[PDB]
Point group: C4
Chain length 350, copies 4
């Protein structure tokens, strides 16, 4: 009755996020321009760069999805749209030179209907995107989609534990998306108290997925290009970015001047305005960054430099060999520029 | 023995911002979980919220509106013995609502308690700075002897020893919290306290052996803190600042810099005690929030979402099964929204 | 092959006031009835555990007198001539037989300065140096005990049990603890040296208690609860600089800035203090005007009584031997202060 | 194998602000301690200070002034081969002073070294972002063969394995620091680094088994961080930001908000390299006046720290000094606190 070991273990676990750690440099024979950044998600899915633009109404529509795929990445068309209008976006990406494209779908009554229209437009992956991927409703929906479409790429999320990954994998998902609470615009951890520090979530989830040969997506909480290197080194095959893309020219929306420079709307899909309700995100603005190619060049540039530092010729080597070292707040403050007034902003550091 | 000398600095304590709730398998949607809670057979709440017994939080108006939302209001004691009984009668005659009243450890304790009993109080709150004192113990023992079936809520404590003492004195409910209050300076002027999450857990650990519920009182700033407080062992939470700005709290609206505010002060501040001193609280202001129903709705909404993430169909499952993970300051900064300029405030996040 | 000091370089861990809280315990005693008296030596006993630091912006004659009349002690600083310090000592003693101390450095004329101070009937000399664990201090302690066998000798500053042992065997009957915590101090920034003050107080009290010798917890106390923690860590008495520097009896006058009154407060290792090529170990600043010393002492003694009440301590020896701490994170400290509410009025004990 | 999978998050690292030095018994007065240091028999310094090889820190006037203070300046490599050999010659002509020069791992690296040796350079710094790479190792091995008596400082590194490899390639001094720089963004944009205090200690642990010194390069904001670096194992420290504001640094002064400033930027920044992907930023630091005044405060802090540690010389500090770890609250206790600062101190801003 009172035997319960769960009571004494409540505060046992410990979690790390990007700003808690650094990558330990290692012997390198390979130059950053020489490393390989390709990644294989499935038999039918493979990215030249391990970057995906989030399926949010302020980040990824067709224009973003086309530019992402042209960079070697992938864009997830968001679902705050009609089924008719979302299938229309997917085809536009497909007829534009054989580009890859993904589309977001929820766990709803009309989900399979939406999925039917998406397969008709030749989408390469559907994203079964929910706030709590570790639920029977997601589980049953993955199983439902897999029975009708045995060869369709299914990305299921979001989860943050090894048990949740195993469940989604056994339900039929071929890619698992990791991240509960880390988002730049996300308040889930504050209003519900729920989450796992993102780097520990990647490691714990990839640890389980590794046993099934299934890739993991690190989704959210990435603020600099160095965070992407940590996430890939923590076990994930690919990262999903929201904030770092919302200011790019191809994302939906126009430019507005705020505090003298150009800005674009960036808001969570669980925010009040996006849902038009106890919300789990906010609405905001990120600086305008210009064309997507410039942001992607800096992102890949940081990944190439990071891989050079770790002697990792490809991302698999980085996943299996890279070591981290933990630091305190004083480590983080030493790691950023410090004790100097920054005069010009770098393409890398705002 | 040098046992007390060698153990001075061994203990470690956690507060709300040190931890997150680990997601778990869920078969339940937020709209279907139960938020009801039983403090005693004659004291049952449909929502796990009590409005603090302070002169800027709970009078009759606050107690009635709290009771209609399914919660409980503690009418504060900075008034005459009779006017407190009228407020009690006003609530009881206002639809048979549950209502509580604060009592101190003083000479006129029994007269006031007698007047509250004649008015049909449903619980008295023996409210003191140091619940683990012989004066509290003696008075609880004295009150249980006169009223063997009256609900007695005693506090405040923060150790298993203090909880065990008050339970053996006769209190059916133990209130936990030394120093975490938003307006509180006890830990700064006196150096004394325990981080509230460890305190709730330490006290609940002892209280669980007796089948005695505990209240998490003070330090809750967002709806997610309540989920952690209930997940750490508390049956119900008591809030001061989260309620002080609502329409039903005592006090007119104050106008500051063109906006609406309400006075909020500790019962140990200079201003509250005049109705020389060495205070343990401060005097302040919180923004006006409107009607109580909206704040409760956001609070319950966040709890419901949290229970869904933790797979908790009821609060008992949350108490016995929810697990935490500890995080650094870097983890807390990842948990809030970050690196985006916030445009509009959310109903959930000011 | 033995690499023992090499492998131990980063082993130790230290705590200060903002890292910990005092754990409340069973109490039968009301704050208004606790005893805050403390005995440093047979000839030096204080009714309240408070000493004003020997700095030229904190303690001169008026400050030591108001401190003594409250049951505490004032250390008159040595940034004055020998004659002028002896006159200041004389003024305190001729002002009702009050206790008074005086700071002395390790110099050639230290013995000369000490001769004049003892003649003026000083109650304690404070052998004040930056690095109490040095041969010059020790030999000077040994030299003064030989000439003045019944003289109260306070020696500092130190931060280790070993340093405590050395000064005690040299002959000091009181040891003063604190390397770098001072509000105006930069020793740890410019020199890289120090020990977190709560760890320093506990480590030195661990050694000094074996000899039956008290320690003074000196510096780093910013709020009244910090005094409770330091006494709970083993100190008989605490020494304060900034919390007293703004008081009426402190030397210096009040300046007005932005409508509020301030007083100058500077480290004795600051440029200005050495003025009346230099690598200082302090800075110069201002603290708020606080009015008469009695109000500050009342909040200070009042906060301590509240703390001892929470700890069930009828006397300060009980607090020293029994009080327990719990460690907390930065998030613990943010919860401990007032938070998430706009503070409207200034509290008498919280600014 | 899961061993590497399992060991990803085992290590822990400390930086300057995580620690304090524990005072120890002193029989030595601060003004009598020795701050002389020996990097090699042909390279001996009166003070353990080296000015970084950056285009905003060290040119000829800086290196001459560093040597005259008892230190050393590394002439930066963002100039032509002739322009760098000429500056090395200029320092030598100013009284037989010591001077060092930075070289990259490039095709024309050997050509530049030949000119620096003809100018009688005392040490070359084979300076790279990732010293633990085959290109550096191969470049070090051939330089040791051609110039067997040349002082070779190779960097940068942050692990013992990297230190051991650079020593086996032939370098007599190892330079430690990946990411601690005030103008550095490597750890943010590449995700890679080792907290500078742990990196110095890890590298000094390995180098000392060979009798090889290490230079603690970067991350020093106050003179007490320097005492920590030497107590953590480095023979000498290298500074960029604490030296760029002096009169002798390259360039002139700009006026900002009523005060005087000097440009300070990383060598991996856009401006120094001029699509590029930077690992540094561009900035400004306050003007400080002559080098002698900044050095005086720095060595003064070193003397005080050694005294507190009872270290009569720097060897004793390296072999005996102890640390104690502290949290952010200790660090806040360590700085001035709860007092409004009125006047600027010569060593604390
Ligand atoms: C990205 C975010 C955060 C997000 C994005 C948009 C909207 C939301 C809202 C604010 C609506 N928040 C939740 O929806 N919160 C939530 C919490 C717990 C559970 Cl258990 C839950 O429902 C689960 O059960 C359903 C079937 O299994 C499926 O919807 C699954 O999410 C939902 C969140
Ligand atoms: C909510 C707070 C904090 C509070 C609320 C109102 C007033 C106070 C003030 C500032 C007046 N502070 C105390 O009152 N401080 C205190 C401290 C230690 C002890 Cl030991 C103590 O007395 C205990 O023993 C007595 C006999 O049982 C009983 O009164 C019990 O409080 C009181 C605090
Ligand atoms: C409150 C402070 C910090 C303080 C107060 C006044 C002046 C100073 C200055 C700025 C002058 N700084 C030192 O004086 N720094 C220092 C550092 C190491 C040593 Cl080892 C040292 O000397 C020791 O040895 C002598 C006896 O042999 C004796 O002077 C003793 O302090 C002095 C500091
Ligand atoms: C002070 C800094 C940081 C620095 C200074 C100047 C320029 C750079 C730039 C921005 C150009 N960034 C790199 O250069 N990043 C880098 C990352 C990984 C590797 Cl593996 C790498 O190259 C290694 O392989 C080469 C052959 O040995 C050799 O150059 C060695 O460094 C370079 C950094
Ligand atoms: O409103 C929301 N609440 C919680 N998470 C969200 C919300 N909107 C987007 N997200 C998540 O946050 C990620 C983007 O995070 P970012 O890259 O840190 O800006 C998305 O890919 C989603 O996984
Ligand atoms: O003035 C006081 N000093 C210390 N604690 C107080 C004082 N007044 C109320 N409290 C406690 O602090 C809590 C404040 O709740 P909060 O605003 O939610 O943090 C109250 O519910 C009491 O338990
Ligand atoms: O300039 C100095 N440098 C370092 N420490 C000092 C200096 N002057 C005074 N102190 C110390 O700091 C204490 C006061 O610190 P406070 O009470 O925190 O302001 C004094 O009693 C001395 O121990
Ligand atoms: O642009 C760069 N990126 C990264 N590190 C740099 C760059 N430029 C110089 N450094 C390093 O930073 C050191 C100076 O750092 P500081 O003394 O802390 O400001 C130099 O000695 C180099 O090791
Ligand atoms: K840096
Ligand atoms: K977040
Ligand atoms: K508080
Ligand atoms: K300090």
């Amino acid at each position: 009755f009172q035997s319960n070991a769960m009571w004494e273990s409540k505060f046992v676990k410990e979690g790390l996020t990007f700003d808690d750690v650094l990558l330990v440099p290692a012997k390198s024979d390979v130059l950053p321009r020489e490393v390989s950044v390709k990644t294989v998600l499935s038999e039918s899915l493979q990215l030249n760069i391990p970057l995906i633009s989030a399926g949010m109404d302020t980040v990824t529509e067709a224009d973003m999805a086309i530019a992402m795929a042209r960079q070697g990445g992938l864009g997830i068309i968001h679902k705050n749209m009609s089924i008719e209008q979302q299938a229309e976006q997917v085809d536009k990406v497909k007829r534009s030179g054989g580009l890859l494209v993904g589309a977001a779908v929820g766990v709803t009554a009309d989900a399979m209907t939406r999925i039917d229209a998406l397969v008709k437009a030749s989408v390469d992956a559907i994203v079964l995107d929910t706030a709590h991927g570790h639920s029977q409703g997601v589980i049953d929906k993955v199983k439902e989609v897999r029975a009708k479409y045995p060869s369709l790429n299914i990305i299921a999320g979001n989860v943050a534990t090894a048990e949740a990954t195993k469940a989604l994998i056994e339900a039929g998902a071929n890619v698992v998306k990791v991240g509960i609470g880390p988002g730049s615009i996300c308040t889930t951890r504050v209003v519900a108290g729920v989450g796992v520090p993102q780097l520990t979530a990647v490691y714990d989830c990839a640890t389980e997925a590794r046993k099934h040969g299934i890739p993991v997506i690190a989704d959210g909480g990435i603020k600099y290009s160095g965070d992407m290197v940590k996430a890939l080194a923590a076990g994930a095959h690919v990262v999903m970015l929201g904030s770092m893309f919302a200011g790019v020219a191809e994302s939906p929306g126009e430019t507005e001047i705020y505090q003298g420079r150009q800005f674009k709307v960036y808001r969570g899909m669980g925010s009040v305005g996006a849902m038009e309700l106890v919300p789990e995100g906010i609405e905001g603005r990120v600086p305008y960054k210009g064309p997507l190619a410039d942001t992607v060049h800096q992102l890949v540039g940081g990944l190439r430099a990071g891989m050079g530092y770790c002697g990792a010729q490809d991302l698999e080597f980085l996943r299996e060999n890279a070591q981290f070292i933990r630091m305190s707040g004083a480590g983080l403050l030493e790691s950023h520029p410090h004790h100097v007034q920054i005069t010009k902003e770098a393409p890398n550091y705002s």
